[PDB]
Amino acid sequence: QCDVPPNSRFDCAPDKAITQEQCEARGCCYIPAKQ
Amino acid sequence: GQPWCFFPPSYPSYKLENLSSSEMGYTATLTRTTPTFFPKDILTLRLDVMMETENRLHFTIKDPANRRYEVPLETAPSPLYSVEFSEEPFGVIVHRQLDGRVLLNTTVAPLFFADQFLQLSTSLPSQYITGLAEHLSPLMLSTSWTRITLWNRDLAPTPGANLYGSHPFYLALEDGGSAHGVFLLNSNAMDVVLQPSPALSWRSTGGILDVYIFLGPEPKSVVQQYLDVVGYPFMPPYWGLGFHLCRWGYSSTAITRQVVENMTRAHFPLDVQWNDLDYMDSRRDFTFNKDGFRDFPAMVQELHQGGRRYMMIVDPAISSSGPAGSYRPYDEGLRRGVFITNETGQPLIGKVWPGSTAFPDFTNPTALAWWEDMVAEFHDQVPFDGMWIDMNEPSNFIRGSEDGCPNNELENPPYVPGVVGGTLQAATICASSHQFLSTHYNLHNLYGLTEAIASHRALVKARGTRPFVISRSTFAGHGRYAGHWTGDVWSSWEQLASSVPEILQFNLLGVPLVGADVCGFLGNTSEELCVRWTQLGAFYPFMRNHNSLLSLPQEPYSFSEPAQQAMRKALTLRYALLPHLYTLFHQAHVAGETVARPLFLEFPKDSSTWTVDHQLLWGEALLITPVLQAGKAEVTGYFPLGTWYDLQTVPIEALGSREPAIHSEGQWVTLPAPLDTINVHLRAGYIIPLQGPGLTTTESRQQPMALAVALTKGGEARGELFWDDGESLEVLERGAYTQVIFLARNNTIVNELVRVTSEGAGLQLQKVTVLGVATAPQQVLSNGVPVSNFTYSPDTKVLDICVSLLMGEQFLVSWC
Ligand SMILES: *[C@@H]1O[C@H](CO)[C@@H](O[C@@H]2O[C@H](CO)[C@@H](O[C@@H]3O[C@H](CO)[C@@H](O)[C@H](O)[C@@H]3O)[C@H](O)[C@H]2NC(C)=O)[C@H](O)[C@H]1NC(C)=O
Ligand SMILES: *[C@@H]1O[C@H](CO[C@@H]2O[C@@H](C)[C@@H](O)[C@@H](O)[C@@H]2O)[C@@H](O[C@@H]2O[C@H](CO)[C@@H](O)[C@H](O)[C@H]2NC(C)=O)[C@H](O)[C@H]1NC(C)=O
Ligand SMILES: *[C@@H]1O[C@H](CO)[C@@H](O[C@@H]2O[C@H](CO)[C@@H](O)[C@H](O)[C@H]2NC(C)=O)[C@H](O)[C@H]1NC(C)=O
Ligand SMILES: *[C@@H]1O[C@H](CO)[C@@H](O[C@@H]2O[C@H](CO)[C@@H](O)[C@H](O)[C@H]2NC(C)=O)[C@H](O)[C@H]1NC(C)=O
Ligand SMILES: *[C@@H]1O[C@H](CO[C@@H]2O[C@@H](C)[C@@H](O)[C@@H](O)[C@@H]2O)[C@@H](O)[C@H](O)[C@H]1NC(C)=O
Ligand SMILES: O=S1(=O)N[C@@H]2[C@H](O)[C@@H](O)[C@H](O)[C@@H](CO)[C@@H]2O1
Ligand SMILES: [Cl-]
Ligand SMILES: [Cl-]
Ligand SMILES: [Cl-]
Ligand SMILES: [Cl-]
Ligand SMILES: [Cl-]
Ligand SMILES: [Cl-]
Ligand SMILES: [Cl-]
Ligand SMILES: [Cl-]
Ligand SMILES: [Cl-]
């Protein structure tokens, strides 16, 4: 369910800086960009 | 950059339910069952899909339980599009029917629809997308995680910033050279996010989703279809296409008269003299000071006596601090309730040039009547010919108001787009302030457009001829009422180069009357920069040299003799081409055509053109390849497949002081470009009307005309001329114009008379220049009789013919 190609990821935190826990609590995927 | 926190495919969206078919198209209910992280989700929406034309698809997503803010806007056989729907998650899918290409697919991300946050996403068909003004950017927008903010803002143009105007329209190219356009009719603060998949997200802070899709298939057809909805460009007066000269710092009528004198003595054409804030009494609208400007009315009357026009700056904000009864614009505005009001119902007070100011509400019909009266009364004192409307974001020198702004959800919204200053209040008025139609929150991006509409109407009533309005702030559909200049550009090589993409972008958005301040506004120009900027700027559809208060002078007559010669040549060529430029504005006005256009609009099937934005065309036929860097004596430009004739091979007469043809297979060509030269090439197959010289259009319009005939290899060419009185209203409706087609075929040139009336009948044709004549003719005939005189150049293959003909009477010119 979190296997989305990097270029096709749509922002689930456009409103504020978010932590992994808050992101997952929203029902979203947390995967840091590699750069 | 790429988001670390992103939606899984299972993220809750809306579900489509009860899809139904209508005569117009489709209707459905959309239901969200899981709330988003934004407040005030609208859980039940109505979808309406309207199949309006074969090339226009329209859909709306609204709250069926509450009227929401909507932008005020005037209204084999098969469509080019097909539409399908995803049920869960909800999406609209639009295919191009001809090749099955997916143009729109909103299933790619969740639909968000909350009171102050709308988000709709789509796949894009390619990495090539243009539009979403106003930003300092390449014509083709970067898809590398780019956030584009639409929130009208007073800021000197710089990359990555929301600037003076907002145009929520994009044109997307498809592999093979087809294109489509998308218009989101939403005036709220918004971010548009582009990503490399490629995909786009609209993120708006209010209103509804009102979406138009234009199927093209040609880029020129997409622009025309968009302009069908927002309005075809207004027809300018002919004089408006002449040279305009302005600065901040012409501080008296004596100094302003010296500008015209100095231009005239140095043989520089000038149609329109401008003043900035200098004319006013204490920087107030509809006044003039009794020091430097005591004889302002006489100065303007004298300009008119010499065949010139006059323009001056008008700001929106009205001085509120004067003694009661001493300043009619404020006193009468107060009486009639014309101003934007605050929470207690009093005028919102900000700070602009005169000090404390109130802001007119141009959505209030009574404010329109007040503005008409103030313009008409001032015009009875000083007969100005148009209005330069500045600071109409609206610009505020303080944040919000003198009394600050209240703490509410409009001033402090749940989603703030990427605006400079990080707040909707920065450099403007309170978002929760009251206007007749809605709050400033919803109407801000329309403020400049509403002032342009009010000013257009005011000028029609005051003068009874075509209005001439130049506006800083704009919105989609602005071009129906007014033109634009790109604002406070620095006098730099970077801003000279950036002006080309920006002028092209506004032409795609239906604002063809656009230009940048020639030689730049801020800072000090150099002589070399001012020569190159005058050369390029002579191909801006709106050509004005304007200059800031603290800058060194940059009028053409203020430079060295060699620089003056180059600037004179540029102005001479523009004046010679005015009948052609006017005809291009006619095509914009009647058919939604562009005036200045990128190569990709004219040659979309040649993918090499897609990234070219440092060259421009005028219409189909004139390719301009400017030098945009210091120290350059050559330029490399792209030449699409065909023959391009050097315009230097066409004789042009001036009042004061290299390959003849490029044969291109579609390739980059290095051209000589010394300081005194700008490269201009005429496309084979085209005929251009030209007119003799003048220091004004009043003088030039009385001169004999000429044709430049660029033959194809097969000896063919086509062109046209539109002619009217240059300033009357309702010319096309009344039929008060002449329209002529020129055709070259089999060693002959003829005219075809589409319409001939008194306006145009007596136009004299005295010269015909034919490019691409391979062999010297033995004889040249005009209506069957050997001409008085002709010259043939074997080196340039140019045949130059003297004739005595009338544009409005059928002729036949022949050679062999
Ligand atoms: C709505 O706009 C009106 C103006 O149209 C605002 O009126 C301003 O109200 C402030 C007080 O809140 C006034 O300031 C006061 O001035 C007097 C002397 O002039 C001084 O003694 C007080 O200490 C204070 O500074 C201000 O004069 C007044 N402006 C005008 C032009 O009268 C009103 O506050 C606005 N309402 C909201 C809620 O923002
Ligand atoms: C989807 O529509 C159904 C049916 O609605 C009816 O038919 C339509 C053409 C229109 O004429 C409506 O006015 C009709 O009510 C909805 O289900 C009905 O819901 C109503 C009110 O809750 C109820 O009285 C009926 O018994 C239901 N009928 C059936 C056949 O189930 C349904 O709610 C609509 N869905 C959404 C999400 O709005
Ligand atoms: C529109 O976009 C949607 C979502 O990206 C596409 O649907 C997905 O397609 C993938 C890959 O084929 C499937 O494995 C998924 O199950 C689909 N997702 C959903 C939500 O259905 C869809 O293919 C696109 N439509 C078109 C016509 O291109
Ligand atoms: C118009 O040109 C005149 C003449 O060149 C300018 O007046 C001269 O300007 C210099 C300053 O650069 C003065 O020192 C000279 O005394 C002036 N000469 C004459 C003949 O009067 C004038 O400034 C120009 N005006 C504008 C508005 O450009
Ligand atoms: C623009 O120029 C202003 C005046 O500069 C002075 O006068 C001219 C004739 C030159 O000789 C110059 O070298 C002189 O210093 C400046 O006051 C102003 O700072 C300049 N603006 C910028 C942004 O550089
Ligand atoms: O210098 S400004 O901030 N830029 C505005 C405008 O953009 C300029 O064109 C104009 O000359 C100025 C004076 O009226 C305005 O003030
Ligand atoms: Cl999850
Ligand atoms: Cl949260
Ligand atoms: Cl409303
Ligand atoms: Cl690109
Ligand atoms: Cl009066
Ligand atoms: Cl109302
Ligand atoms: Cl290439
Ligand atoms: Cl290159
Ligand atoms: Cl004749």
Numbering used by the authors:
A (entry chain AAA): 81 to 115
B (entry chain AaA): 123 to 197, 204 to 785, 794 to 952
Could you give the paper's own sentences about this structure?
Retaining α-glucosidases employ a conserved two-step Koshland double displacement mechanism, in which α-glucosidase substrates are hydrolyzed using two key carboxylic acid residues functioning as the catalytic nucleophile (Asp518 in GAA and Asp412 in CjAgd31B, a bacterial homologue of GAA) and catalytic acid/base (Asp616 in GAA and Asp480 in CjAgd31B). Mutations in the gene encoding for GAA can lead to enzyme deficiency which generates multiple phenotypic forms of the lysosomal storage disorder (LSD) Pompe disease (PD). Herein, we report a 1,6-epi-cyclophellitol cyclosulfamidate as a new class of reversible α-glucosidase inhibitors that displays enzyme inhibitory activity by virtue of its conformational mimicry of the substrate when bound in the Michaelis complex.
The X-ray structure of human α-glucosidase rhGAA in complex with sulfamidate 4 revealed that it binds the enzyme active site adopting a 4C1 Michaelis-type conformation in a noncovalent manner. The interactions of the cyclitol moiety of sulfamidate 4 with rhGAA are virtually identical to those observed in previous reported complex structures of rhGAA with the GAA inhibitors, acarbose, 1-deoxynojirimycin (DNJ), and N-hydroxyethyl-DNJ (NHE-DNJ),21 notably with Arg600, His674, Asp404, and the acid/base Asp616, strengthened by solvent-mediated interactions with Asp443, Asp616, Asp645, and Trp481. The endocyclic nitrogen of the sulfamidate moiety establishes a tight hydrogen-bonding interaction with the acid/base Asp616, providing a structural rational for the lack of inhibition of the methylated analogue 5 due to steric hindrance. The endocyclic nitrogen and the sulfate moieties of sulfamidate 4 overlap spatially with the nitrogen and subsite +1 aglycone atomic features, respectively, of acarvosine reported previously, reinforcing that sulfamidate 4 is a true substrate Michaelis complex mimetic for GAA. Methylated analogue 5 proved to be a much weaker inhibitor toward α-glucosidase GAA (IC50 = 485 μM) and inactive toward GANAB, suggesting that there is no room for functionalization at the endocyclic nitrogen. Cyclosulfamidate 4 proved to be a low-micromolar inhibitor of GAA (IC50 = 5.17 μM) and is 5 times more potent than NB-DNJ 2 (IC50 = 26.7 μM). Kinetic parameters determined with increasing 4-MU-α-glucoside concentrations proved that cyclosulfamidate 4 reversibly inhibits GAA with a Ki of 3.40 μM, approximately 5-fold more potent than NB-DNJ 2 (Ki 15.2 μM). Thermostability assays (TSAs) showed that α-glc-cyclosulfamidate 4 stabilizes rhGAA with a maximum shift in inflection temperature (ΔTimax) of 11.2 °C and a half maximal effective concentration (EC50) of 1.16 μM, whereas α-glc-cyclosulfamidate 6 does not prevent enzyme unfolding at increasing temperature. In conclusion, 1,6-epi-cyclophellitol cyclosulfamidate 4 is a selective reversible α-glucosidase ligand that binds through 4C1 conformational Michaelis complex mimicry.
